[PDB]
Amino acid sequence: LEEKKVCQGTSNKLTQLGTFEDHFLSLQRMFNNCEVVLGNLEITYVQRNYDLSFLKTIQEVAGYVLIALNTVERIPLENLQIIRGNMYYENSYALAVLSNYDANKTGLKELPMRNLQEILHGAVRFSNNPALCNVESIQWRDIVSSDFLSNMSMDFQNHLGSCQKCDPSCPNGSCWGAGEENCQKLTKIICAQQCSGRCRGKSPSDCCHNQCAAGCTGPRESDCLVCRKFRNEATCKDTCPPLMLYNPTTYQMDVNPEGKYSFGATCVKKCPRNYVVTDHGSCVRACGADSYEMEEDGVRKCKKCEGPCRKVCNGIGIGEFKDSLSINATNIKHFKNCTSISGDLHILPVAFRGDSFTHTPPLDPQELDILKTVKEITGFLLIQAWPENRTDLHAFENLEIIRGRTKQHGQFSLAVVSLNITSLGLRSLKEISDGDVIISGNKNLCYANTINWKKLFGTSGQKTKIISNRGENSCKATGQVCHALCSPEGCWGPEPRDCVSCRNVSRGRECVDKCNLLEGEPREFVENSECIQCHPECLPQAMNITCTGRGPDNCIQCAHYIDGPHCVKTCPAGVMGENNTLVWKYADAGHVCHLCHPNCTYGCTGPGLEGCPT
Amino acid sequence: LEEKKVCQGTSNKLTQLGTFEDHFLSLQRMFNNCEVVLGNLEITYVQRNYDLSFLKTIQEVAGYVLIALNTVERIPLENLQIIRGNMYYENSYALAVLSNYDANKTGLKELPMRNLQEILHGAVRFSNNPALCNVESIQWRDIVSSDFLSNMSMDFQNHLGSCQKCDPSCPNGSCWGAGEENCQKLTKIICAQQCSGRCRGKSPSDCCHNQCAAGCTGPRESDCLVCRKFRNEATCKDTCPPLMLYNPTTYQMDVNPEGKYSFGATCVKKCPRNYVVTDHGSCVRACGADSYEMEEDGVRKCKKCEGPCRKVCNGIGIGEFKDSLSINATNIKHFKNCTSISGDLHILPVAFRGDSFTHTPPLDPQELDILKTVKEITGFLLIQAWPENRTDLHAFENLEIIRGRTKQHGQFSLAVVSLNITSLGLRSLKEISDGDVIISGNKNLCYANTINWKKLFGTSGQKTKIISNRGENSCKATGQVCHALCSPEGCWGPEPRDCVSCRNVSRGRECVDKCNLLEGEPREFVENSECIQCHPECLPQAMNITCTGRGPDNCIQCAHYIDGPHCVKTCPAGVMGENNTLVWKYADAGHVCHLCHPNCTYGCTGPGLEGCPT
Amino acid sequence: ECPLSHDGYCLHDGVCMYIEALDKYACNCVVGYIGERCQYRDLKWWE
Amino acid sequence: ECPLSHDGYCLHDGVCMYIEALDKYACNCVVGYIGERCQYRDLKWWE
């Protein structure tokens, strides 16, 4: 069976996004054809005559549901079955319908949520809707759980008389509107004494499974309308089946033939490639407090550490930086020496001009070098501002991985927008494990559409969005192309140390035209297209090559003396040996090193005793 | 019934334990006052006019039930509710009634198992019971699981026919004999399509939980008659509640306030003190080969092996050693470098004489020194034979722990019966973590009573059964009472090296009366009731104390060079200190060598800077 | 509209508003910027 | 009774016997020894 289409949902509570039609276009552009909102559902500032019929598809919301400040007459949320309530509005509410009138005290009228049957966690708040019809009759006992029946705030005041009665066919007049299709379907309070949860009837043969959230169409666990905690292949589980089962007979643990990894609210066959795999059989985002993320054995793992594990910082939006929205000038200290951000990174224009609202001073551009030790982000990277004097993302030169576990808007994992930089300069970036890439709006940066991003993309379905940066020929005319010392693979900047691969060879972190063979100041050799210096004790060969390796063992001829296989500067004269006996040697004719006479303690300048006048 | 009285259950398939009245007593001593047979239930060779009325208390057999070769009329297994079938008879059957007739064709007539409603695994077999009647009428489709409904082998013949038909209030005429309660109680095949497991009535409001095994008195998991897999102190669970719970919203693991450790078929709050604890929270007996057990914080965990982790050899009766029953000469080789036996140890008289029926050559007595490297046994140690020329248990000399995870008869973890040995000789045994001790029947064994076995035990409730050895008055009558140079704590032999503790002081392993502080051998110093020699550089004196500690910081006489805060035979001649040069130390008249300038780095055998020449 | 403590509340040149119906403060974001304080660019639509 | 293929099957002086009904071979242990072939001493009764 096919997945349900998901949408991210908004998180801007009462904020208006432009005019009344700029706002409605964003609401429409987001929740069109959606069927499962992963975040919140916020319907605000919708004016009359607007057609909200694209909301007829949403079936469950994982956050809250806020309906405020509207003036439209009817909001057709008539397929919503569940509000999971994983996030509250005003700390207590998983459904708030507030102040839906215009100046004339005539606003929202028809909210026919005729399929809304359960609100997992949270209360409900209704207030100040002077034209709302047929909702004060609802019995909210069947919907919201009994733990929260005390935190509810229902204020109903129409008392104008623009409503019609409820079709006399449902218990106690409880109706969601007018019609034989539009009244409350009770599934919890009409249960028999033995039904553990929801029940599709009053007879004791109608109890649903203990994991059906809204209701059911059968007694089993594959007959739920919507699962309550976890979701197996087609059944509703309480917990994902463990990978290993205990054997009460042999007092050991046996492999489970259908053990699944718990990932999010589903049981999968195997964790996603970029997620950490614990031993409980669960895909997580960060190893435990006493564990550090162990290397890839094909997959990520958590290994226990001895004493201090390491220095790893929490990114923005997690841990102590839960409500900070940028890299303040006050929190920047806490990223002092950590080489792996365990979260996100936002750099917004607020950091650089300060924020008086949260009492934050302006950030100092020279302090951004604190991030030069970072080598791995496990979330995303969002750079919206950079100091204008700088012409490169200098703080992120040592960055190598972006894991992309949490993405921006749920899609992007690297975003560089509206900056003054001339080149990106992430010269050591190697991989982007998940999420898209947007680099657009930078009026000068053009060293950006040369990289082969498909090399960095760890998975499939990743794309790059690089538009309206600079010219693509206006900096190829002024010469802002890469150095001819770079492979056609790509280039991060104008230097030769800013290429993906080299044309000929390389001197460490920089590309060159040829190794220093034959001539040059330091003698070198070639292996894997790298230039390594010969041991200082290798004689500068003006004819052929000089050496065939790093060690003095590969020299063509030595510079001073020769102690056997090795090329030494001066023959040993005090080196520890066997039986605690010292070692003294001498240089003969061919500058060869030979051992002294055992007796010669103060060393010797010749063979045997005649050689050392002691 | 806060706890059900358990018994171990026999394992004698068709063996007869002596005369017909000696067999009946073993059956009567094993199963008297039992309610849960932890093993098998075998009722064989029960003759006519014998009282089997002690069987009416059994409620659950965890293995198989074998009823064969009896000639008694009525076997009253009325309370038997379930046969878990953890072990089959003939690889197939969890219940077997076979050939219950004597020569006169008379025999079994009444088998009133009215409460037998479930057989979790295995089939049923009936054969050659030419007097058993009112049992072919049962419908075994309700009892035996549908997976094994094909292996069943049921053939009945009652040519005699001396009994009556089934009471009218019997379902389809199916009765367990004459009577109204003797009718069969159907709980699986009569019920509606809602009930997945068992049930109580034909109505779909009568389905039992899927964890109840026989039946139920309610719809909750807390209303089962017997549990199907596990038992959380009041409720039948599928698996024990985990210790950590996944969180689909933060993608991290959280502590479970109601997490239990699984220990057999029960979920407990903490593992026994001598069991291993895994990270799943499960009490195991010996964890996987990829890991190795280790003590930590009072409990016994096990960490991952690093390359070559030590050898842990299997025990008799587990793994590749299930066929075997002793250390027969075939498998003695597999125990070479073992420092722990994960399992048991059975040394039986059939090892030293060789078994034809299994083709094992007679073991060579000297071949037992291989066991002188074993240092602990996680199961038990059972010794029934030992070479006749020996005096003590020499092969088990470095044994230190007997954890007693699995025991013998479920009771004894150290059993040394009917040996010609003179002294025990286990002069390393420090703990017997569980199980009783029996050291009885040894024809001439002294010293076995001087040990207070309370000090060795680790759990309260462990007895000892040291009975009928060499007489305690006939031990001292020939001087066979251990040395007076030892504390009144015990002794495993006549030598001073066999005492548990001493009266004055110990010297490495042997206990002496003083650490020769004044005369004789190289004098030492006392610490922690030992004798420890100070390094022989410490010049000895024959007048009073000669040293205080190991190092030279506290000696009194130092004939060697007293190089300041220490002593040494010869002061250093270039030891690696600072300045990256051979740190020299010239010769002194007061044995206190000092350092000279870097100029004389040859031997600087003179004091001062200008005073070292060549 | 909104008091002195809420100057610089709306980022990216948004304008702060007072909602007398609910007694709250909200931002009127410019086109292209989302979030409660107009802090985020709308990367999913038009750069 | 039982053939020479079963010599020494019963340990501790037990006598091997044939069960013509079930067509199998079993032991008759002496008093004090238990097990399928009389291999174990009965510890919890009479030492």
Author numbering:
A (entry chain B), B (entry chain A): 1 to 614
C (entry chain D), D (entry chain C): 5 to 51
Q: Which lines from the publication concern this structure?
A:
The epidermal growth factor receptor (EGFR) is a receptor tyrosine kinase that couples the binding of extracellular ligands, such as EGF and transforming growth factor-α (TGF-α), to the initiation of intracellular signaling pathways. The extracellular module of EGFR consists of four domains, denoted Domains I, II, III, and IV. Domain II, which bridges the ligand-binding domains, contains the ‘dimerization arm’, a loop that mediates the principal interaction with the other subunit in an activated dimer. Domains I, II, and III form a compact unit that we refer to as the ligand-binding ‘head’, and Domain IV forms a rigid and elongated ‘leg’ that connects the ligand-binding head to the single transmembrane helix.
To better understand the origin of this apparent structural heterogeneity, we used 3D classification to further partition the entire dataset of 765,883 particles into 10 subclasses. The resulting structures for different subclasses differ from one another in the extent of a ‘scissor-like’ rotation between the two ligand-binding heads of the dimeric extracellular module. When the rotational angle between the two heads is at its largest value (~25o), the two legs adopt similar conformations, and the membrane-proximal tips of the two legs are juxtaposed, with a separation of ~5 Å between the Cαatoms of the last residue in the legs (Thr 614) (the ‘juxtaposed’ conformation). When the transmembrane helices are in the N-terminal dimer configuration, this linker favors a connection to the tips-separated conformation of the extracellular module, and when the transmembrane helices are in the C-terminal dimer configuration, a connection to the tips-juxtaposed conformation of the extracellular module is indicated. For the tips-juxtaposed conformation, the reconstructions for the EGFR:EGF and EGFR:TGF-α complexes are similar, with near-symmetrical densities for the Domain IV legs in both complexes. The only noticeable difference is that the cryo-EM density at the very end of the Domain IV legs in the EGFR:TGF-α complex is slightly weaker than the corresponding density in the EGFR:EGF complex. Cryo-EM densities for the Domain IV legs in the juxtaposed conformation is similarly defined in all three complexes (EGFR(WT):TGF-α, EGFR(WT):EGF, and EGFR(L834R):EGF).
